[PDB]
Structure formats: C-alpha cells, structure tokens
Structure 1
Amino acid sequence: MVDFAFELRAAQDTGKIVMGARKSIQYAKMGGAKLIIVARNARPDIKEDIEYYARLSGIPVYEFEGTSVELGTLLGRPHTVSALAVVDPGESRILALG
C-alpha cells in the first residue's frame, strides 16, 4: 500500500513538485502536472478550481486526509500548504494514488 508521507517526500526530493494553490491551478490549467494534492481544509473555491482544471486535462486529484498545517509540515515548511502539484514523481510511487 502507498505510504503518503514517505512517497510525497520522495517526490519532493527526487522528482519535481510545485507548492501552493496558485502554482497548482496554473499547472492544472496547462496540463503540466501528473497529480494534484489538496488539503482537506483547502478553501472551497480553490478545491473547486483545482478539480475543474484537472478534470479538463485528465489529471487525477487526491484529497489529503489532513489540514493545510499537516501538509506543510510533511513538506518541511513552517507554513500551511493548501495544495501542491506533482510534476515529476522521480523515484516516488505517489502517482498510484490517482
């Protein structure tokens, strides 16, 4: 089974990710992400924007079962992260969550 915490970090370290709603939506729009991760407490219109643009491109969205606080901490940031996009998984198995 896919270890979220471990595979997210593995993607961060060996692949390419962009963080935050703005970048996530932008990469969704341009069809440039392989997966978009959204925190459970992401602002309703941000969730709905991501889901829309991702659906247009056939990019899977995964809702993280935790707050933007926990997601930030997982990503090693001392701030909230409401969404992120996996551009290149690298050695990560994170895309299986799609």
Structure 2
Amino acid sequence: MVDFAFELRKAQDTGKIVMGARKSIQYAKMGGAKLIIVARNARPDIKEDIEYYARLSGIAVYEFEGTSVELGTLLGRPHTVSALAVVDPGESRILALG
C-alpha cells in the first residue's frame, strides 16, 4: 500500500513539488501539476478553488487526513502548509494516490 508520508517526502526530494495555496492554485490553473494535495483544514474557498481548477484540467486532488500543521511537518517545514502540488513525482509512487 502507498505510504503517504514516505512517498510525499520522496517526491519532494527526488522530484519537484510546489507548496502553498497560491502556487498550488497557479499550477492547477496552468495544467502543470500532476496531483494536488490539500490538508483537511485548508480554508473552504481554497479547497473549492483547487478542486475547480483541477477538475478543469483532469488533475487528481487528494485530501490529506491531517491538519496543515501535520502536513507542514511532513514536508520538513516549521509552518503550516494547506496545499501543495506535485509537479514531478521523482522516483516516488505519490501519484498512485490519484
């Protein structure tokens, strides 16, 4: 089974990810992400924008079952992260979550 925490870190380290609602929304809008991940407690209008732009392009959206605090911590950051976009999965299996 896909280990979310392991594969997400592996994507971050071997691939290319962009972090935050602004950049996630932008990459969804441009059709440049392969997966968008949103924290459970991402602001409603942010989730709804991400879901919309992703739906326009056929990009998978995955809802992480933890808070923006936990998601930030998983990504090595001492701050919240509400959303991220996987641009290049690297050597990871992260896109299987779609």
Gaps of 5+ in 2: none
CA drift at 1:79: 0.1
Identity %: 98
Q: Distance in 1 between matches of 2:8 and 2:20?
A: 15
Deviation, 1:46, is: 0.1
Cα deviations by residue, 1:25-55 (Å, 9 ceiling, x for unpaired): 0000000000000000000000000000000
In structure 2, how many angstroms separate the alpha carbons of the residues matched to 1:48 and 1:73? 24
Q: Secondary structure at the match of 2:87?
A: strand
TM-score for the superposition, normalised by structure 1:
1.00
Deviation at 1:5, TM superposition (A): 0.1
Partner residue, 1:95: 95
Q: What is the total number of aligned residue pairs between the two structures?
A: 98
Which contiguous aligned blocks of 4+ residues in structure 1 show a shift greater than 4 angstroms? Answer: none
